[PDB]
């Protein structure tokens, strides 16, 4: 089991850390959601699906910077939503193919004015936890999520 990003970096077998850079809607109003879709950013696969089933959770999602100070909301993981920043580990998603499969995570963030997220800033850290039905591997793939652009909340 290993993963790759839309910015051309990787995390190999056994886990590790990578940076992800997301383009964000430049304007989000109060009462609206800013969507941060990681399924277009993070892709993973199973290295031996003939015999091994991989299980993948969002272990913890943490907020930083302007997201931490100016937003609340949810994380949607494989079709169900939970508070973000997270308060539990999600259910598992199965990875059962060598073919790249998106990691089905998206943040829905709503403003609690002006530049609310600064370009280049860290907005979130998402920990992907991978186990399997084969051995006792239990690995963390740590994704540091950065904004590529400013996000403005109008008055
Ligand atoms: C080379 N001979 S073989 O066909 O029998 C063979 C080759 C590779 C493997 C192999 C076993 C464990 C592996 O472990 C990783 O990949 C798993 C499947 O994605 C993960 O569950 C593990 O955590 C680990 O990343 C990867 C490849 C097994 C058999």
Instruction: Kindly report the three-state secondary structure assignment for every residue of the chain.
Output: CEEEECCCCEECCCCEEEEEEECCCCECCCCCCEEEEHHHCEEEECCCCCCCCEEEEEEEEEECHHHHHHEEEEEEECCEEEECCCCCCCCCEEECCCCCEECCEEEEEEECCEEEECCCCEEEEEEEEEEECCCCCCEEEEEEEEECCCEEECC
Q: Which ligand 1 atom is nearest residue 137's CA?
A: 23
Evaluate the omega torsion of the peptide bond into residue 85 and state whether it is cis, within 30 degrees of 0. Answer: yes
> Which approach determined this entry?
X-ray
At how many Å resolution was this determined?
1.1
Residue 16 has phi, psi (to 5 degrees) of 145, -155
Confirm if 47 and 2 have CB atoms less than 8 A apart: yes
Token pair, residue 112, equals 């609690």
Residue nearest to atom 10 of ligand 1 (CA): 48
| CB of residue 138 inside a 6 A radius of ligand 1 | no
Q: Structure tokens of 108?
A: 């829905």
90 lines ligand 1 (CB under 6 A): no
Total domain count, the chain: 1
Residue 138: give the domain boundaries. 1-155
Residue 32's alpha-carbon distances to 7, 26, 110, 112, 153, in angstroms, are 28, 13, 6, 10, 10
Of ligand 1's listed atoms, the one at least distance from the Cα of 130 is 23
Q: What is the CATH number of the domain that holds 5?
A: 2.60.40.1090
């Amino acid at each position: 089991f290993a993963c790759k990003t839309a910015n051309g970096t990787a995390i190999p077998i056994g886990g590790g850390s990578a940076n992800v850079y997301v383009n964000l809607a430049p304007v989000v109003n109060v009462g609206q959601n800013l969507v941060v879709d990681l399924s277009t950013q993070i892709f993973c696969h199973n290295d031996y699906p003939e015999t091994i089933t991989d299980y993948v959770t969002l272990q913890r999602g943490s907020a930083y910077g302007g997201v931490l100070s100016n937003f609340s909301g949810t994380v949607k993981y494989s079709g169900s939503s939970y508070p973000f920043p997270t308060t539990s580990e999600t259910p598992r998603v199965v990875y059962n193919s060598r073919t790249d499969k998106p990691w089905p995570v998206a943040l829905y963030l709503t403003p609690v004015g002006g530049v609310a997220i600064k370009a280049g800033s860290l907005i979130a850290v998402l920990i992907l936890r991978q186990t399997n039905n084969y051995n006792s591997d239990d690995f963390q793939f740590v994704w540091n999520i950065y904004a590529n652009n400013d996000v403005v909340v109008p008055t």
